[PDB]
Design a protein around this ligand. Sequence first.
Ligand code: HEM
Length: 180
Amino acid sequence: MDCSTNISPKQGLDKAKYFSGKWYVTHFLDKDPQVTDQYCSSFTPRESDGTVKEALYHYNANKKTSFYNIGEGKLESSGLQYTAKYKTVDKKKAVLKEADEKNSYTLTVLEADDSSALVHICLREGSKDLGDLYTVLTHQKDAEPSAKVKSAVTQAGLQLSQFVGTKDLGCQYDDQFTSL
Ligand code: HEM
């Protein structure tokens, strides 16, 4: 599998709209899933002087367990786009497995407004592309994505109906973890 190629950040995006609040994934489009378990996700991205740091939460909807990461990377000159290396952590943010030089994800912000966002994520290990995901984001669980973000999905060449809606997965979130 190869990550989607026609991906660059929307120029003109306000970083104050993206690096704010927390995000919950309402809809995801996974090209070629790594495993067949389905996940819910929430995360809290912040930026300072070109360096992004984000607390990341995954809930496995099949097994009903959850895992935690902290990503860190630098913003590209293109706009709201960054490649992050990542640590695994426990629910209290104690570090377990350190970040390395071969595992990374590249996140590209396709749209972002006061309530909603559309991002693309390419997860890699070494020379291998492992995950390719588009995610529609909102600031509260089960909030409706804005018309502007729905337009962005259609502008990305995609069909929103072909995404998996997470509402039906029975997602559980750890909002203590994603605070800060
Ligand atoms: C609902 C949306 C999402 C789904 C369905 C999803 C799905 C997945 C899956 C299936 C894996 C492999 C897990 C396993 O090995 O069992 C994974 C790993 C990972 N994802 Fe997500 N993901 C989502 C959102 C995100 C977002 C928004 C980010 C970053 C902001 C992200 C970053 C990562 C990272 C860093 C890993 C590797 C974690 C590790 O191995 O320690 N994912 N994702």
